[PDB]
Amino acid sequence: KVFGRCELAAAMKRHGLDNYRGYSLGNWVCAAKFESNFNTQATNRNTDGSTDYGILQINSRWWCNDGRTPGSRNLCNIPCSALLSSDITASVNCAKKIVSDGNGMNAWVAWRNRCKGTDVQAWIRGCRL
Ligand SMILES: [Cl-]
Ligand code: NA
Ligand code: NA
């Protein structure tokens, strides 16, 4: 399922992302846009066994388990398939685990590159009427 920009931003605000660990809402929409293009079903079969999953393109090497990434971790204790659900809640909760450990959103390359310097409050403008 591909979210509308404001559809997504609303949900991300209901999932408590607004300023979560120092990161305003537009940040989260900006990384979602530039990781998956708002599509909860986005995958990216990284060259080795690893695979980026869902709206925030979570990597199976570290966070979830697909059953195909030898000696990966599962730091969210979820199977990857759950990220592709079209609900963002699983993707959103594992992301909160990622931003606290201390990088934080730098953990997402698309955020690090396409969002860091931009004016990010623009990714949520016009979404209230
Ligand atoms: Cl913002
Ligand atoms: Na695995
Ligand atoms: Na979780």
Numbering used by the authors: 1 to 129
What does the paper say about this structure?
The needle shaped crystal with three molecules in the asymmetric unit had a diameter of 25 μm. The resolution of this structure was 2.65 Å, crystal belongs to orthorhombic space group P212121 with unit cell dimensions: a = 31.4, b = 92.3 and c = 114.2 Å. This crystal was refined to an R-factor and R-free factor of 20.60% and 30.45%, respectively. High R-free and R-merge values may be due to anisotropic diffraction or radiation damage due to X-rays. Total 47 interactions including four H-bonds and 43 non-bonded contacts were present between ten residues of Chain A and five residues of Chain B at the interface. Chain A residues: Asn77, Asn93 and Ala82 were involved in H-bonding with Arg112, Lys116 and Arg114 of chain B, respectively. Chain B was also weakly associated with Chain C through interaction between seven residues of Chain B and nine residues of Chain C. Analysis provided that there are three H-bonds between Arg73 and Gly102 residues of Chain B and Gly49, Arg68 and Arg73 of Chain C, respectively, besides 28 non-bonded interactions between these two chains. However, PDBSUM and PROT-PROT based analysis computed only a fractional gain in the β-sheet content (1.8%) and decrease in helical content (0.7%), in the trimeric state due to the formation of two parallel β-strands made by residues Cys64-Asn65 and Ile78-Pro79 in addition to three anti-parallel β-strands (between residues 43–45, 51–53 and 58–59) known to date27. Interestingly, residues forming additional β-strands in our structure (Cys64-Asn65 and Ile78-Pro79) may lead to destabilization of β-domain due to their close proximity to the residues known to initiate unfolding process. Further, we also observed that in the trimeric arrangement, chain C interacts with most of the residues which form the active site pocket of chain B. This interaction implies that if such an intermediate occurs in solution, it should reduce the bactericidal activity of this protein.
